[PDB]
Amino acid sequence: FGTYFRVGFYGSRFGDLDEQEFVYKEPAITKLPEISHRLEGFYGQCFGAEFVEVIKDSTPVDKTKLDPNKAYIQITFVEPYFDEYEMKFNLRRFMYTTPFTLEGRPRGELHEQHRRNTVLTTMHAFPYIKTRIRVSQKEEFVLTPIEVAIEDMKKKTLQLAVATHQEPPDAKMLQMVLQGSVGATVNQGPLEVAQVFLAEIPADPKLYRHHNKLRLCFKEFIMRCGEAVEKNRRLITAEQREYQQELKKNYNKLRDSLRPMIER
């Protein structure tokens, strides 16, 4: 298919391109570091490397925070965008997300964490005679902290379900998703999510919809964990017996802990 990126240019060194944004269509599976090195390297050849910088963030650029003498490139991965109702060839809309908190930082506690979905509309639609298209419109939508948590859950749940039920089996992928689901040792684990968002039943009715949605994501999530656990029992090597025991122990503890919260 292809990989898309928002690309925008800042500083008077860019002449006509200053402040212009495009969506670039890259081949196959292109990763951030590759398009970034391409663009920074190209402009380094045109301007000289000392004058070229990659903006390392997707937030709207504030020119006053920029060295006026340099040429800045903002590069952001985007995916083709469909409204939730649409979710259930010709591509004019693309979206990137950026994490933010109301306290002014990109990341915060679970209860602080928002996400901004920035929707870009291109001047023309892909597929297109050139490899990039000008951005003609930009809209911003926000997800509140519980909504961010809902997505984190749904997306992990689907990943786990696929890892579990794929044929032929891939035990490595199953174990990776599953250990990271019921066994996290680096990140905090999903229990914390339930404790924050589901522990109290909100008074506000608008908030009740999200509360109920998240509750239902937890049902689906823990269900898929159990399926993951029983499935893995069949895939493991004798060497992995103690590994499996732990995963089962982790699942049971999480299951029992969530139970009171999933009923409410």
Next chain:
Amino acid sequence: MQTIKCVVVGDGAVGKNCLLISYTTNKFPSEYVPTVFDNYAVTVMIGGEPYTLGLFDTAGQEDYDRLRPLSYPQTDVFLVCFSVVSPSSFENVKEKWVPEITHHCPKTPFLLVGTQIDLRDDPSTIEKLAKNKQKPITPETAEKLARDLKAVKYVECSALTQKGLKNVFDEAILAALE
């Protein structure tokens, strides 16, 4: 073929998680969406062939000394990580990480991965280390260490600048395929 199992180890706070989540999501460090979940899957193309990497993120702390190796069986390749601005993390490659993974998986290939290379050539960082009676780890010494400990090779990267980041995972896959 199937998922290549890549276990990622090294001292806490060397930027292991940051580089895994950045690369696998196509995001710079300040824009990555936080998650309460561990590890990362990524599909990468090398010579027009897709390959899938399962990246197992691990907790380096001693509290996990008993639990961590439970993930070691069936590992295809290890990444042994240290920060080029943390001599302690580099010394731990020698005294902790290489011995640990080679004790569990004596035949399994591993790479040495230096991180935070964007800080290494910054004069103020060098000077801050100098005041603490330290110096950063040069590619030459890490390369020598890699050869001395029989790592498949030495690679380095910056999660921030993205420099060498694609290459770290390519070499992991190449090491696992043989």
